[PDB]
Design an enzyme around this catalytic site. Structure first.
Site, PDB file in Angstrom:
ATOM      1  N   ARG A 198      12.495  39.675 -33.201  1.00 31.96           N
ATOM      2  CA  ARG A 198      12.729  40.096 -34.571  1.00 31.96           C
ATOM      3  C   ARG A 198      11.427  40.029 -35.357  1.00 31.96           C
ATOM      4  N   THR A 222      10.303  43.232 -43.101  1.00 28.93           N
ATOM      5  CA  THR A 222      10.873  44.480 -42.600  1.00 28.93           C
ATOM      6  C   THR A 222      12.342  44.316 -42.224  1.00 28.93           C
ATOM      7  OG1 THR A 222      10.230  44.117 -40.272  1.00 28.93           O
ATOM      8  CG2 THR A 222       8.602  45.150 -41.720  1.00 28.93           C
ATOM      9  N   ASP A 272      16.413  28.717 -34.946  1.00 27.95           N
ATOM     10  CA  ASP A 272      15.946  29.697 -33.962  1.00 27.95           C
ATOM     11  C   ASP A 272      16.149  29.195 -32.536  1.00 27.95           C
ATOM     12  OD1 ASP A 272      14.934  31.776 -32.651  1.00 27.95           O
ATOM     13  OD2 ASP A 272      12.822  31.406 -33.084  1.00 27.95           O
ATOM     14  N   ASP A 318      12.667  29.096 -30.387  1.00 28.86           N
ATOM     15  CA  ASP A 318      11.741  28.022 -30.739  1.00 28.86           C
ATOM     16  C   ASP A 318      12.275  26.670 -30.284  1.00 28.86           C
ATOM     17  OD1 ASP A 318      10.242  30.102 -31.998  1.00 28.86           O
ATOM     18  OD2 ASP A 318       9.863  28.942 -33.788  1.00 28.86           O
TER      19      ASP A 318
END
Lengths: 213, 175, 205, 209
Positions: free
Chosen positions: D107, D111, D203, D206
């Site tokens: 991702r 944006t 996440d 991560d």
């Protein structure tokens, strides 16, 4: 096991260890199934991880334990692991187990049906500045194109000291290592004779990716 | 006495020591540490060649001729074995590489080694994470050819005969 | 007798088929055993309790569940340690207790040996693990010392069961529940289960 | 313990819920995060593979001949990189015979749209089942991207395995593919400013790498 110097003073270390040999002899056999090839590859990766993580600096840590307080140790270099895909992904899901504290980045290469030149689509990696140790995880170091191209972006971000882990390499591949990065170190389980018409290592393992997926 | 001072070993041993660490992380940092002991202790091991064929061409590998009979000492050294089978898949198991986290006093170990060489056990290797001088003293008292691999040598035991600093009761921190 | 639950799941059946084949190497034997165990665990831990528990995400406060009473695992050795080191994974919170037994090549009896446990009190669920419940002597010996301390509900997880072994179960304990991958024909001359897998111990050690 | 919506199956199993709780906790080490992930992946596999072992197998035990079963048509596994690879080295355990294919996307920061890239894929036509592995089905972009190229190669029935999904992602699923089946351990409320699933786990990548 020393291992050898070669052209750019590329230093190679040959894991001649007995349990290394045995896993290797499992990895090459054509009788062995993809399961046993994945499992053999995995246990063989910690052997390489162990032989490479020797002179890794440490760091004392203040700690308790049961029955009073004491002091332990903790490694100090946070190893970026870099799987070369597609093939170097069996190797990573318990290098983690060897190195829990270590982070992972993604770059790789794939070969053409005939020309054999590496294809490059991917860039998902860290802010890989200077003082960052980087182990590259690729089973077959063959022509070098795949290897050379990852390190090409490693060093672009100023990758420091580089180690490369591999089951088998070829004299072509190590040569293109010296030409690319003279201060990278290479750990293999075996040096082989060379490549062939289809730039597959011989004797080698066959196509390493195909017999895991 | 061969002390595995390898950094991953010293790290994993640091984690086994800690009081904060869950039994599960205790069980995870023990199994993984046992691999290093296996790797150091098997590095002069005798081998044997094997004709095999790859998918491409034909060649010759190495077996290791005489794989070891593991012996885990209860109740403590069985969180070791289910990963030592991973290192040595062809190793048979008894209930020689002896597998026991704390060599403290040595009686538990020497009582085992007495029945090992009873039957006719040649060279024995021992694998522990922590040993007490007392335990090593007991060792050569009983067999003075045995070799021992440990992650550290500690001060000795205490009033209750636990190794200090040590890790506590290795059995209690897995089950 | 009763109460048996046969795990007739697609993956379970494939893993059993691997475990039975004589062509399979003991490394593949232990791996297929290992994998086949979780399936039994998963089935045997469907009507387990839950708390709920307050926890915090990196992004918001929420509640999950854990198990309120995670079971005392009791592997029957020599055979059942290829079973336990992966049950551990499925149930991190489960504690372990040990006893072992050895059936002879003449007397047909198990020389039981082991007494290494967590002393009894509850209201503690127990999952005994051993691959071949053939005669029932090994199982029945263990259950005697489980319920000697006052064991509540007992679950038995195994690979294959014989009618004679199940018969001894509800001879000893009629309230235990059993989860097998298959019920076979019976024993033989030598008190081995036929078709079975051979000797489950020998095929890992 | 499964469950249904109205395509979606929520695995409400005691071990699944126990393992799920561990994945969200912030206190847990990433090693224990990946260990907890590893087990919870198989639970999803087991619920999702209630099917297809329609081959009998002639074999012989050490004590006489008998017949067993195996699985016919084993699924092609597709972990979404970089997150769903802590899942696949143990799906392998669940499904030894399953072949593997790769197709990852991340991702973007601001944006929104995922910068796609990844084509490491087998020789797939019609009657091949696929089990896509990705822990967090958030926006749907990463997923639909994959499924766009899966069903370009005429993929038949597709299953998706994840740990948690947001209503926005499942919304995105059935507009990309209305025949895909989804298996999560929990449905949360949705996304947040930066399109992370809340409560979620943070996440998922991560927290392993």
């Amino acid at each position: 096991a020393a291992g050898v110097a070669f052209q750019g003073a590329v230093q190679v270390h040959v894991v001649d260890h007995p349990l290394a040999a045995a896993r290797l002899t499992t990895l090459r056999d054509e009788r062995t199934d993809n399961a046993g090839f994945r499992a053999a590859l995995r246990e063989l990766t910690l052997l390489l991880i162990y032989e490479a993580t020797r002179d890794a600096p440490c760091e004392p840590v203040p700690i308790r334990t049961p029955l009073a307080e004491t002091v332990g140790s903790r490694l100090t270099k946070p190893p970026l692991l870099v799987p070369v895909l597609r093939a170097g992904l069996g190797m990573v899901d318990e290098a983690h187990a060897a190195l829990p504290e270590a982070h992972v980045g993604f770059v790789g290469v794939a070969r053409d049906e005939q020309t054999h030149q590496p294809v490059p689509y991917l860039d998902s990696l860290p802010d890989d500045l200077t003082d960052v140790p980087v182990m590259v995880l690729d089973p077959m170091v063959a022509t070098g194109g795949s290897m050379t191209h990852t390190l090409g972006l490693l060093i672009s971000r100023g990758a420091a000291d580089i180690t490369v882990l591999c089951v088998v390499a070829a004299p072509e591949g190590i040569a293109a290592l010296q030409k690319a990065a003279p201060n990278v170190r290479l750990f293999t389980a075996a040096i082989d004779e060379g490549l062939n018409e289809v730039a597959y290592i011989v004797p080698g393992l066959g196509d390493a990716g195909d017999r895991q997926f």
